[PDB]
Amino acid sequence: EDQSVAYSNNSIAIPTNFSISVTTEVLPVSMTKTSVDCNMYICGDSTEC
Amino acid sequence: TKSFSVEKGIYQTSNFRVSPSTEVVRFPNITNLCPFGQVFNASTFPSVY
Ligand SMILES: *[C@@H]1O[C@H](CO)[C@@H](O[C@@H]2O[C@H](CO)[C@@H](O)[C@H](O)[C@H]2NC(C)=O)[C@H](O)[C@H]1NC(C)=O
Numbered sequence: 782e783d784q785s786v787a788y789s790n791n792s793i794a795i796p797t798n799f800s801i802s803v804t805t806e807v808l809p810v811s812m813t814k815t816s817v818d819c820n821m822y823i824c825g826d827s828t829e830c
Numbered sequence: 831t832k833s834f835s836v837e838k839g840i841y842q843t844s845n846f847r848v849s850p851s852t853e854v855v856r857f858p859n860i861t862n863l864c865p866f867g868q869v870f871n872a873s874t875f876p877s878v879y
């Protein structure tokens with residue numbers, strides 16, 4: 782939305798009361814630890830491979 | 831880890847420990863010989879067309 786305001790050279794806005802706001806910030810930290818057996822994946826149970 | 835000296839820690843290893851010995855060869859119970867006659871030892875063969 783547009784809330785156009787022009788200017789002033791002798792006016793000042795003062796806030797008269799406040800609100801305490803609780804916000805949530807969500808941040809990943811770690812990922813799963815995975816290991817691979819190269820021989821078992823590539824060849825399985827074959828000696829020739 | 832291809833070395834004769836290993837530093838302190840925990841490591842993941844391969845199998846290197848168990849190998850098969852015996853064998854299982856179960857096949858169906860048929861025994862009748864296939865008719866190699868009339869195919870190899872036949873009297874007349876047809877024309878190629
Ligand atoms: C700014 O102050 C006024 C009081 O002067 C607040 O209005 C009060 O709000 C509380 C709840 O948070 C009520 O229990 C009070 O009864 C209200 N006023 C009175 C004294 O009757 C106002 O909430 C404050 N600022 C903001 C925007 O939260």
Ligand SMILES: *[C@@H]1O[C@H](CO)[C@@H](O)[C@H](O)[C@H]1NC(C)=O
Pocket residue numbers: 788789790791
């Ligand atoms: C700004 O302030 C001066 C002070 O002399 C005044 O003359 C002028 O008219 C004002 N202009 C505005 C933006 O009101």
